[PDB]
Amino acid sequence: TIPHLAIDPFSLDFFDDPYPDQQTLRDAGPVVYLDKWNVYGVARYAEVHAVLNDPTTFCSSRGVGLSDFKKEKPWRPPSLILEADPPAHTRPRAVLSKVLSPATMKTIRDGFAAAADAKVDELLQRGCIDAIADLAEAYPLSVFPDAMGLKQEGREHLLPYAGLVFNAFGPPNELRQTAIERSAPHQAYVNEQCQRPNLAPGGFGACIHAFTDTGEITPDEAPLLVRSLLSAGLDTTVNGIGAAVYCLARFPGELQRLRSDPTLARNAFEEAVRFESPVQTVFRTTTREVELGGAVIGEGEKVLMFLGSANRDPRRWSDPDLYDITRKTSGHVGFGSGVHMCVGQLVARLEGEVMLSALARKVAAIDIDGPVKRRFNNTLRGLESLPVKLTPA
Numbered sequence: 001t002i003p004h005l006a007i008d009p010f011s012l013d014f015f016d017d018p019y020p021d022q023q024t025l026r027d028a029g030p031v032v033y034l035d036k037w038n039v040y041g042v043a044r045y046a047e048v049h050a051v052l053n054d055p056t057t058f059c060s061s062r063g064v065g066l067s068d069f070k071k072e073k074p075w076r077p078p079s080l081i082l083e084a085d086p087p088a089h090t091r092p093r094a095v096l097s098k099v100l101s102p103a104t105m106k107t108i109r110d111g112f113a114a115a116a117d118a119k120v121d122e123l124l125q126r127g128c129i130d131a132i133a134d135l136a137e138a139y140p141l142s143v144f145p146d147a148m149g150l151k152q153e154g155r156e157h158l159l160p161y162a163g164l165v166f167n168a169f170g171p172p173n174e175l176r177q178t179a180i181e182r183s184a185p186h187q188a189y190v191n192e193q194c195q196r197p198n199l200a201p202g203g204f205g206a207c208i209h210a211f212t213d214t215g216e217i218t219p220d221e222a223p224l225l226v227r228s229l230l231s232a233g234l235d236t237t238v239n240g241i242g243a244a245v246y247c248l249a250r251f252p253g254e255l256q257r258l259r260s261d262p263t264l265a266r267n268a269f270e271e272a273v274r275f276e277s278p279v280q281t282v283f284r285t286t287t288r289e290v291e292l293g294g295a296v297i298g299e300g301e302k303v304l305m306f307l308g309s310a311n312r313d314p315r316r317w318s319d320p321d322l323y324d325i326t327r328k329t330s331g332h333v334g335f336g337s338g339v340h341m342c343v344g345q346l347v348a349r350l351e352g353e354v355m356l357s358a359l360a361r362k363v364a365a366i367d368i369d370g371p372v373k374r375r376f377n378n379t380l381r382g383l384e385s386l387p388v389k390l391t392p393a
C-alpha cells in the first residue's frame, strides 16, 4: 500500500541537489517508506503539517533524529525542550519564550541593527568577499555570543558544536560518526559556559538562570536550557542569512525590489527561510498505531518530515521554486509548526531583517564571482563558500 524507495535523504548526492528526489518523494504518495534507514517519510505540506501538530501521536521525547532514545542512549543528555513532550515540555518552553520575547527583542534591536550596518559597510570596503565566512558567519558571531553573555575565549567552539548537534540527528553515516568522534572539546566548552557564573549579566543565559525561582524550572534545569540556545541559536541563523544572501545573489530582480522598499526586509528573509529551508528535516516517533495518508503506521516507528519539501510543495504554494519577497509566507514550516515551533524565531527574524535592511540600503548589486561550495550536514542546508562582489549603492 505504501511505496518503498531507496532514496537516501542523507547522502551527499541528495544534499548537492535535493529537489528532484523531493518531488519523487512527494509524488510517490502522502507516506513513503525509506528502505535505506527503515523510517517512514512524509514530504508533502499537508502531512508534514499534520504530523507536527499531533505531538501526542508523533512524539519528540524519543528523539527528533533517526536514533530512538527508547532503543539507544542519546549522545548527550536529552534537551529539556526539543526532546520533551507535553507536559514536561511546557514550562521549559514557557521560560525560553519569555527569555526570547518581544521585550528582549526591543532591548537588543538597536545593537543588532548597528552591527548589521557596520558589517555591510566593512564588507563594501573590501568589495569582493565570501558571503559565508565574512557575512553569514561573521554577523551572527558578532551579535549572538554577546547577547548570550558568553566570554570571548573559546567561541571558536560554537559553530563546531552546532554542526555536531545537527549532524547527530542524522543516520550513522560518515558525517555523523566523524562529528561525534571530534566532539569532546566542544561539549566540554559548551557545558562549562552553561553554568550561571560564566554568563554575563543581562544576557540570555543569565535570564534563563534568573527564571529558576518562579516554579517553572529549577536551578538544575537552567544549564541545559542555556545549552539549547548554544545548540540551536547560531548555526541555524548562519544558514538562514546565507540562504537570504544566496537568494538575492541569484534573483537580482528581487534585490532590486528590496532596495526599492527596505521595509520588505523581514518578509524577504522569511521567504528565504521557506525557499532554502536551512533546517531540512525533523523526525518524530509514533506512540501508537496511526493512520496517516491512508497508511497504517505501527507504534514506535520513526517518521521523517521533509520541511524543505513541504515548503516547495506545489499542492500548497504557487510557483514554489520562485524566490518572491512579497509572497504570503505565513504557514511555511521552515521554523516548524505547533508546540515545538522555533522558540527562537524572533531572534532569527530580527537578525535576518536587520541584515537584509542593511543590504537593501547600502548595496546596489550582489554578483557571484567565484566557485560556490556547498556545506554538508545531516540536518542543515547551506553553503560553505559564496564568493560575491558587492557593489555599493
Ligand code: HEM
Pocket (backbone or CB within 6 Å): 060, 064, 081, 082, 083, 093, 096, 100, 228, 229, 232, 233, 234, 236, 237, 239, 240, 241, 273, 277, 278, 279, 282, 333, 334, 335, 336, 337, 339, 340, 341, 342, 343, 344, 345, 347, 348
Ligand atoms: C533561521 C534560523 C532558524 C531556523 C530555520 C530554525 C528552525 C527550527 C525548527 C524547524 C524547530 C522545530 C524542531 C522540531 O519541531 O522538532 C526549531 C526549534 C527550536 N529552535 Fe529554532 N531555528 C532557527 C533559529 C533559532 C534561534 C536563533 C534559536 C535561539 C536563539 C533557536 C532555538 C530553538 C529551540 C530552543 C528550539 C526547540 C523548541 C521546542 O522544542 O519547543 N532557533 N527551530
Ligand SMILES: O=C(O)c1ccc(-c2ccccc2)cc1
Pocket (backbone or CB within 6 Å): 064, 079, 080, 081, 082, 165, 169, 227, 228, 229, 231, 232, 279, 281, 282, 379
Ligand atoms: O538543544 C536544543 O534544545 C536544540 C537543538 C537542536 C534544535 C533543532 C532545531 C531544528 C531542527 C532540529 C533540531 C532545537 C533545539
Ligand SMILES: [Cl-]
Pocket (backbone or CB within 6 Å): 076, 186, 187, 188, 190, 191
Ligand atoms: Cl554537550
Ligand SMILES: [Mg+2]
Pocket (backbone or CB within 6 Å): 003, 028
Ligand atoms: Mg508510485
